[PDB]
Each structure stands twice: as structure tokens, then as C-alpha cells.
Design a protein around this ligand. Structure first.
Ligand SMILES: [Mg+2]
Length: 316
């Protein structure tokens, strides 16, 4: 390194149950880091107030309490996300669904869930009748629901948060940055030496595929280290929207790379719903850059898509 050189600042903080980390290059112009730390905290406060199902005074919880047939005014975020969600649903053949909260609370995986309980085939049938993206619509500044929908934004919130933080760093003059919120992240520009921002994707055999992010967000659903079979059948908190039950298949993690970190968080969730086979086919069909970790024969196999291979090479 050189003696006179722009600084690479870093801060981190607590989330509701995890951490974020921002890193950025600060020029003489550019903003101080406590300013950004406060801009990032502000943004996270709005997300929590508008979209968290874990607090009762949230906008989404006010919407969730309402009965079938309700139209209710909602803030910009919620409508932005409902809309983004609608597209994700269409692009992923329904594997992406914001309306699973009743099946989540039924299977114990939710905010009002004691947990770890197997519900009947009757309660499942009842709860699925309170689900369905097609029943959600936007009307001016109102969100409407045709059945007693309960929304949950967790499959896309962290990614959206990353994109929002980046709009703000850009608006304040920052050019080069790596923003990570509970695992979702995006980076752009280069460090002062000229090096790029790099992430590692886990690629067990414990190999690692290293990629350079410049204008691209990454999202990883699952972690190959958490793969459980309860009684020789797979245990997970991921539900098929179409069937009421949890997923049976062997996909242990999937990583998506897209310019919109919101989209990566979403498609990532959808691919893990779909599994190793339907996952790959969709990803290839729609041209998604993705890297799958499939648990095969007491070990792991990895598979990358075509779009991923053009962006990053095939090797490791
Ligand atoms: Mg997600």
C-alpha cells in the first residue's frame, strides 16, 4: 500500500437475530461512517415497523389481523414488496409465495408458534384455504385480500434491505462498497489498491468457489452444514406452497446471483422450495445464475447453471 490513499471503512451492528456489515471506500468528499451507520439503522427500523410479523404494531400485522374481503391502506414498502413478490411468484411457477404465514404458524415455524408439532390433514386443508398470492391485490394505495391472508416478507426482506442501503450510499456519493445484511449481500466498485470485492460460496466435497462481485447481489438459502433427517426423512422449515407440508428433497443450499439482491433472496427461496431437479430446470429456463448443494450419498454434490458459468467459470 501507498501512504496517501482513500480509507476502507467498516461497521457492523445487530439485527433482530443476526448481524449486518457495511464496508465502503471513503473519499475526501464521501460521508463519515457514523452517518452511514445511522442511515443504515434508520432503514432497518422502517423495515421492522412496516414488515415484521414479530411485532404487533407492524403495518403487515395490522393487515394480517383483518378478515377476508378487506382493503386496507398500506405503506409504500409493503406494496413495493407485494408487487415484487407477485412477479417472483409468476417467474417461479408459484414456488415463491408471501402468503404462507398460516401454514408457518400451523407447523410451529412462525412468530406465534410454539413449534415442533405435526398438524393433522384437516387443519392443513383449512389453513391452505387462507393462503394464495392470487387472492392478494393492490388498489391505489390499498392492499386487498379476498381470503383471510397472512403475509410474511422474510423470503425477500434482507435482500430488499441491502438494495435500500445501497440506494442511500449511492445517493450520498459512495461508489465502492460491500453491504451484507443477515447473509444477503451485494458489492460494487473496487477497493483503493484496485482489487475487487470477493465472496466465497461453500462447495463441499470443504472447497470454496470464489467470485468477484461488481454490481451483483448474492443470496444463499440453507447452509450445507444444517441438513437433518428426522427418522430418515428430511427435516426443514421450508414448506411447499402447493402442498401444505414441508419439503422432502435433498437440496441443502442454493446460492443465487442477480443484480437485484431482492430478486436473489426471492429466487433463492424459490429454488430451495423446488429442489435439486425442478430447481435446476427453472434456473436454466429463466437464465438464473445459481449454484446448488445437493446432499447425495452421505456427502455433497455441487451443480452450477449455465448463466453462473458464463459469469464465473465452471471450476473450483
Ligand atoms: Mg430468502
Amino acid at each position: 500500500m501507498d501512504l496517501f490513499q482513500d480509507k476502507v471503512e467498516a461497521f457492523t451492528g445487530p439485527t433482530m437475530g443476526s448481524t449486518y456489515t457495511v464496508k465502503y471506500v471513503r473519499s475526501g468528499d464521501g460521508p463519515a461512517k457514523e452517518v452511514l451507520h445511522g442511515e443504515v439503522e434508520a432503514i432497518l427500523g422502517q423495515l421492522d415497523k412496516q414488515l415484521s410479523t414479530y411485532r404487533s404494531d407492524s403495518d403487515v400485522e395490522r393487515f394480517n389481523a383483518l378478515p377476508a374481503g378487506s382493503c386496507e391502506p398500506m405503506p409504500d414498502m409493503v406494496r413495493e414488496l407485494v408487487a415484487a413478490g407477485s412477479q417472483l411468484s409468476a417467474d417461479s411457477d408459484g414456488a415463491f409465495d408471501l402468503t404462507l404465514e398460516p401454514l408457518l404458524n400451523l407447523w410451529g415455524f412462525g412468530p406465534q408458534g410454539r413449534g415442533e408439532r405435526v398438524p393433522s390433514a384437516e387443519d392443513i386443508s383449512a389453513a391452505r384455504a387462507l393462503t394464495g398470492q392470487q387472492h392478494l391485490s393492490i388498489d391505489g394505495d390499498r392492499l386487498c385480500k379476498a381470503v383471510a391472508l397472512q403475509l410474511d416478507f422474510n423470503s425477500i426482506a434482507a435482500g430488499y434491505a441491502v438494495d435500500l442501503v445501497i440506494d442511500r450510499l449511492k445517493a450520498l456519493g459512495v461508489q465502492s462498497y460491500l453491504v451484507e445484511i443477515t447473509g444477503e449481500l451485494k458489492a460494487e466498485g473496487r477497493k483503493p489498491d484496485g482489487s475487487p470485492w470477493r465472496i466465497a460460496i461453500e462447495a463441499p466435497r470443504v472447497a470454496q468457489k470464489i467470485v468477484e462481485l461488481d454490481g451483483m447481489g448474492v443470496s444463499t438459502s440453507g447452509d450445507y452444514r444444517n441438513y437433518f433427517e428426522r427418522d430418515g426423512r428430511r427435516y426443514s422449515h421450508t414448506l411447499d406452497p402447493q402442498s401444505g407440508q414441508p419439503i422432502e428433497h435433498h437440496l441443502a443450499a442454493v446460492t443465487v446471483i442477480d443484480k437485484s439482491t431482492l430478486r436473489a433472496d426471492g429466487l433463492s427461496t424459490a429454488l430451495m422450495v423446488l429442489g435439486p431437479e425442478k430447481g435446476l430446470a427453472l434456473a436454466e429456463r429463466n437464465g438464473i445464475a445459481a449454484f446448488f448443494v445437493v446432499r447425495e450419498g452421505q456427502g455433497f454434490v455441487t451443480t452450477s447453471t449455465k448463466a453462473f458459468d458464463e459469469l464465473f467459470g465452471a471450476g473450483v
